[PDB]
Design a protein around this ligand. Sequence first.
Ligand code: HEM
Ligand code: HEM
Ligand code: HEM
Ligand code: HEM
Ligand SMILES: [Cl-]
Ligand SMILES: [Cl-]
Lengths: 141, 141, 146, 146
Amino acid sequence: VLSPADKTNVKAAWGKVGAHAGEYGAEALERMFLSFPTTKTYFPHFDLSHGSAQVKGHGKKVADALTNAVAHVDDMPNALSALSDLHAHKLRVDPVNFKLLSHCLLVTLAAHLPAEFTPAVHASLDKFLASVSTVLTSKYR
Amino acid sequence: VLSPADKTNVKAAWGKVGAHAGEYGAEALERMFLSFPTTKTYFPHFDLSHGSAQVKGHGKKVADALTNAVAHVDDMPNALSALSDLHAHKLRVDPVNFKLLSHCLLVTLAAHLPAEFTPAVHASLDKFLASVSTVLTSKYR
Amino acid sequence: VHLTPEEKSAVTALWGKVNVDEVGGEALGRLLVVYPRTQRFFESFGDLSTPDAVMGNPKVKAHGKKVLGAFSDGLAHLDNLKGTFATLSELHCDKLHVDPENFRLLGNVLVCVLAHHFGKEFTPPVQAAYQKVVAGVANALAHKYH
Amino acid sequence: VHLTPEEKSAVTALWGKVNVDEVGGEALGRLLVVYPRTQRFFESFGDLSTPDAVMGNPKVKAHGKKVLGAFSDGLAHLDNLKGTFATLSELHCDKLHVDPENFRLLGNVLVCVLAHHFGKEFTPPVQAAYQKVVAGVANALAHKYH
Ligand code: HEM
Ligand code: HEM
Ligand code: HEM
Ligand code: HEM
Ligand SMILES: [Cl-]
Ligand SMILES: [Cl-]
């Protein structure tokens, strides 16, 4: 349950990401593939080399969904319904991978938004990524 | 969420446990202590010996709470609120441990209800245990 | 796998009683039913729409038997699971693209299947030895992922 | 752990630039803030009622420096974390009753603190090597649990 402070915190941090969201999207993916190589099993059709346009484009996609989710922080289940569908009925990614992407996203933000990545903001972003993961995996069975 | 079918399956399987609930709760705890020894860190004050009275006593308590979530299968979050407060504020049990107990509880039921432990019932009981675990860990942060 | 001799005796004893064909089909079917997400790897298997469609699917049964067959061999080389499963590990990663978390799900399902089958004979301590074996096997199968 | 020479050198050279004092206090503090449940072991530290209260608490600050110290020392025995942490593993189990899962939480908090601090320098491949170490340290600390 995102508290009002968390929602504020998230909106701020994400605010600063701005035009770089797609790049942070792509960088998080790249750190995920390297740190947690089992995650590559879901992208056998992608070129996972450094700076692939597949990874780049995929980063954008992801980053965009996060924006939409921040934008509708109060209505995630609803703002992300089509995405929960896709993940639950087509993709069927194992839930543990959501924690690995979430972590690589925190790491990316930390490295790029040093002044905004305070302990309380870190706390909020984590709770937020968790909430997003819950929603995306809520219609699995 | 739990579908009408899941609810029927759970009431039916739990219906059969009946008066054995307490004993099965104790057995689930013992199985957990033996197979996942790290769960022991939460009971430093317990006599974890085979036939411990504390374990017997604790098994009953866990069993009574599951029996209560079954009785209020349409209002679990409210039926278990108190237990959810305790776990969040005092016990502060790491979320992964809920999955270890759930698992040992399915092993116990399987070992005792061969006829009711059908694939369909198994699936329903798993979704149910997962839902209870989710409620109990809902007020953590 | 760190199994005390008496743990290894207990694992072996019970495994003597298992019908690998039977258990293999039950374990794989239950996986597909309890964690439908796992069905992503079997769309060529046909109808997996209901518990009955899964459990009685001749393709699921044949596969389950294959998987548990490979597993039983693993039980005779508890000493060297990594070597035993190395070509299979490569295949799952490189050809099949199976997330190794799937190996842990099957291990847990299998344990429920042995509890189902042996009832009371599947004691707390017998379960603890099998928990160790199953994790050992899941680990050996993921050792070659890259 | 199963650190490559080039992975070994990356870890080693980044660590050389770390202020254990500051990084230790921050990692431990961030942990109590992000995962409030971990406070169950530091009741005696005082007021942990707020992020500011945690980050400011000197008992927290000093505990973090002690933890990162021991972690630091372990980077010298990267080829035997298990032998380096045996005693500490026994203590955490038998005396402190700390669930090893906490070791993994910390490790990840630590990775975020290092990124925070080093920014640009904490590249995907450097992150990958540290993930290996943190996992390795968590595994070693949990090794003597029974
Ligand atoms: C932070 C949580 C996540 C978000 C917001 C997210 C978002 C998205 C979006 C927006 C798409 C594209 C849908 C389209 O093409 O219209 C997508 C596809 C996909 N996602 Fe998720 N994702 C998340 C987590 C994950 C994880 C953890 C994995 C696996 C490790 C994953 C695997 C995939 C795959 C395999 C695709 C399809 C790739 C393709 O063929 O282009 N996702 N996701
Ligand atoms: C669905 C799962 C669970 C249920 C239904 C459950 C239920 C309960 C109940 C009813 C109590 C007793 C509170 C009272 O005295 O009124 C309790 C206490 C406790 N639980 Fe949970 N619990 C669950 C999971 C866990 C897990 C996984 C752990 C740790 C491995 C855990 C650790 C504890 C501890 C340490 C206590 C206090 C024991 C004592 O001081 O006597 N619980 N739980
Ligand atoms: C005990 C763990 C497992 C063992 C020992 C095992 C063993 C095997 C063996 C011996 C084969 C046939 C190899 C070949 O075609 O050359 C196979 C194939 C396969 N396995 Fe695994 N397996 C295990 C777990 C799993 C799990 C949990 C999944 C997915 C959830 C999986 C997915 C597959 C698939 C998709 C195939 C190919 C089937 C086909 O021919 O279409 N396996 N496995
Ligand atoms: C990176 C992993 C860790 C390392 C290397 C480590 C190391 C240490 C060291 C060197 C001590 C000093 C005590 C002595 O020698 O008597 C200690 C104590 C302690 N540790 Fe750990 N620790 C780690 C993780 C954790 C975590 C994650 C927690 C809980 C969230 C924890 C809880 C404690 C507690 C409660 C004490 C006792 C301090 C006191 O009594 O004031 N440790 N640890
Ligand atoms: Cl599923
Ligand atoms: Cl928490």
